[PDB]
Every structure is written in C-alpha cells, then in structure tokens.
Scaffold this motif. Structure first.
Motif, PDB file in Angstrom:
ATOM      1  N   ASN A  49      -8.771   3.635   8.583  1.00 23.20           N
ATOM      2  CA  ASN A  49      -8.124   3.236   7.708  1.00 23.20           C
ATOM      3  C   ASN A  49      -7.534   4.455   6.943  1.00 23.20           C
ATOM      4  N   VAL A  50      -6.438   4.137   6.188  1.00 21.06           N
ATOM      5  CA  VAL A  50      -5.730   5.166   5.361  1.00 21.06           C
ATOM      6  C   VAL A  50      -5.840   4.985   3.828  1.00 21.06           C
ATOM      7  CG1 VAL A  50      -3.576   6.277   5.110  1.00 21.06           C
ATOM      8  CG2 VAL A  50      -4.219   5.625   7.290  1.00 21.06           C
ATOM      9  N   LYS A  51      -6.119   6.141   3.175  1.00 18.73           N
ATOM     10  CA  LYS A  51      -6.153   6.173   1.716  1.00 18.73           C
ATOM     11  C   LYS A  51      -4.893   5.870   1.254  1.00 18.73           C
ATOM     12  N   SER A  52      -4.982   4.998   0.061  1.00 21.01           N
ATOM     13  CA  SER A  52      -3.935   4.606  -0.675  1.00 21.01           C
ATOM     14  C   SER A  52      -3.726   5.071  -2.190  1.00 21.01           C
ATOM     15  CB  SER A  52      -3.726   3.083  -0.576  1.00 21.01           C
ATOM     16  OG  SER A  52      -3.698   2.343   0.552  1.00 21.01           O
ATOM     17  N   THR A  77      -1.715   0.727  -5.247  1.00 22.56           N
ATOM     18  CA  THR A  77      -1.916  -0.579  -4.470  1.00 22.56           C
ATOM     19  C   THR A  77      -1.292  -1.515  -5.454  1.00 22.56           C
ATOM     20  OG1 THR A  77      -3.588   0.033  -3.505  1.00 22.56           O
ATOM     21  CG2 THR A  77      -3.553  -2.361  -3.844  1.00 22.56           C
ATOM     22  N   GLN A 136       0.861  -1.378   0.282  1.00 24.71           N
ATOM     23  CA  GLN A 136      -0.059   0.132   0.127  1.00 24.71           C
ATOM     24  C   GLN A 136       0.790   1.215  -0.013  1.00 24.71           C
ATOM     25  OE1 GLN A 136      -3.582   0.044   0.524  1.00 24.71           O
ATOM     26  NE2 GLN A 136      -3.467  -2.287   0.101  1.00 24.71           N
ATOM     27  N   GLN A 138       0.979   5.019   0.835  1.00 27.26           N
ATOM     28  CA  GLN A 138       0.398   6.041   1.419  1.00 27.26           C
ATOM     29  C   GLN A 138       1.275   7.351   1.767  1.00 27.26           C
ATOM     30  OE1 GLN A 138      -0.281   4.175   5.202  1.00 27.26           O
ATOM     31  NE2 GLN A 138      -2.043   2.693   4.521  1.00 27.26           N
ATOM     32  N   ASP A 181      -1.480  11.916   4.580  1.00 25.44           N
ATOM     33  CA  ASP A 181      -2.741  11.221   4.596  1.00 25.44           C
ATOM     34  C   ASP A 181      -2.683  10.152   5.763  1.00 25.44           C
ATOM     35  OD1 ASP A 181      -2.802  12.569   2.304  1.00 25.44           O
ATOM     36  OD2 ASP A 181      -4.125  11.052   1.196  1.00 25.44           O
TER      37      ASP A 181
END
Lengths: 181, 37
Positions: free
Chosen positions: A174-177, A180, A162, A164, A168
């Motif tokens: 959860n955290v935006k990716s 991927t 992921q 990141q 962010d």
C-alpha cells in the motif's frame, strides 16, 4: 457548424497499450489534441469507452505539453487524487470517467492551474481513476480539488479519495496518503 | 486577478447540452483498435 465553444486549455488524449513494459518500450500513444467542446465530443464519440478497452490499458487526458508521467516537470513535485473502483459496473465506470473529463475541460476547479491531467487504469478486477496535480505541498489547492471531485462524482464512504504523492507511489507491492476524503 | 488566460468555465450540464446540439485520425484510431462508431 462553423463556430465552436473555445476551451480555456488545450488538451491531449493518450492511450497506453500496456502497463508493463521493458525500460526501452514506449507503450504510450498520443491520439489527438483539442481546443473546443465540439472537438472533444467528436473525439469522444469515436473512441471506445473505458469499459470496452483491453485489460492493462490506460486512458489519459493531459494539458498540452505535459506527458502522462510523473518524471515530467509539471508532475515531478505533484501528486494525484486516486479513486479505486472495485466491483463497479461498466456504465458507472464510463460515466465516472466522462464526468472527470468534463471536470477537466470545463475548468470545474478554482485552482485550475494546479490541474495537470487525469488517467484511468483498466485492470478488469479493480480499475482506478486519478486526477494529477502539480504540487503536493499546495494543501489548499489539493483539498479544494478533492472536495470538488467528491461532489461532482457523488462519492460516498464506499469509495474513498486518496491523495498520493508521486514520489511515495514507488512500491512494487500500500501507499501513504497525504490527504483522505 | 487579471491575466492573459481569462477563465472559461463550462458546467457538466452545459457541456452535455452542447453535445446534444450536434481527418486522418480514423486510421490511427483503427490501428490501435480504439475506433468505434
């Protein structure tokens, strides 16, 4: 034993005693810096593998004059490739971490000057290994590095990569990716 | 491109090979309970 294989970069090993601290506490410790393969191996053979260090500890290998923080100039606009290791064995953990270190010091990436460092978080339940890069907007570099990582660690679907941004990543729970793999 | 930092690469295999053919830091390693032999 006089001669040693020179590395392209000088690296520094860091140990984090505790992941949670008060705003004035500095739980991050410089351990040593190295310029050669032999010196790295010497350091490695005398420290505990990540499978044997305290829960809530971190290991971090960063290039000289770059701190293991995102507020740093080298990390501010950058990001990280994150690997989550749920229910992973100890030997597999140690091996993944070591192979990561070897990717770093061995300059396994074409965009080498995009690599800042790497860090392993030991939390017992779910541990993590991350590779920090300098610029999240540098798509080509990020993707290249991610693919190299994927191959060098022989990752399958079970363990996803992921990417990141550090900006962010500021969530208490959860955290935006961005990317991927 | 030619620059002041030429590329020095080592494969995982090479690095392991080098490992096979083989200060006051011990104190601080021991103080952090990180030291191992």
């Amino acid at each position: 034993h006089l001669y040693k294989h020179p590395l392209m970069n000088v690296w520094t090993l860091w140990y984090l005693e505790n992941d949670r601290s008060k705003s004035w506490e500095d739980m991050q410790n410089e351990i040593t810096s190295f310029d050669t393969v032999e010196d790295f191996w010497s350091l490695y053979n005398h420290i505990k593998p990540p499978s044997e260090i305290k829960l809530g500890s971190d290991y971090s290998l960063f290039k000289k004059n770059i701190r293991p923080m995102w507020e740093d100039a080298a990390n501010k606009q950058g990001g990280r490739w994150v690997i989550t290791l749920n229910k992973s064995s100890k030997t597999d953990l140690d091996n993944l971490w070591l192979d990561v270190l070897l990717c770093l010091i061995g300059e396994a990436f074409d965009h080498s000057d995009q690599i800042c460092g790497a860090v392993i978080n030991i939390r017992g339940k779910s541990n993590k290994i991350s590779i920090w890069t300098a610029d999240g907007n540098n798509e080509e570099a990020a993707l290249e590095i991610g693919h190299k990582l994927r191959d060098a660690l022989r990752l399958g679907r079970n363990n996803s990569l992921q990417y990141q941004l550090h900006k962010d990543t500021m969530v208490k729970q959860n955290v935006k990716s961005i990317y991927t793999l | 491109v030619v620059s002041s930092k030429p590329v020095k690469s080592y494969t995982r295999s090479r690095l392991m090979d080098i490992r096979n053919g083989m200060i006051e830091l011990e104190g601080r390693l021991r103080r952090m309970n990180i030291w191992r032999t």
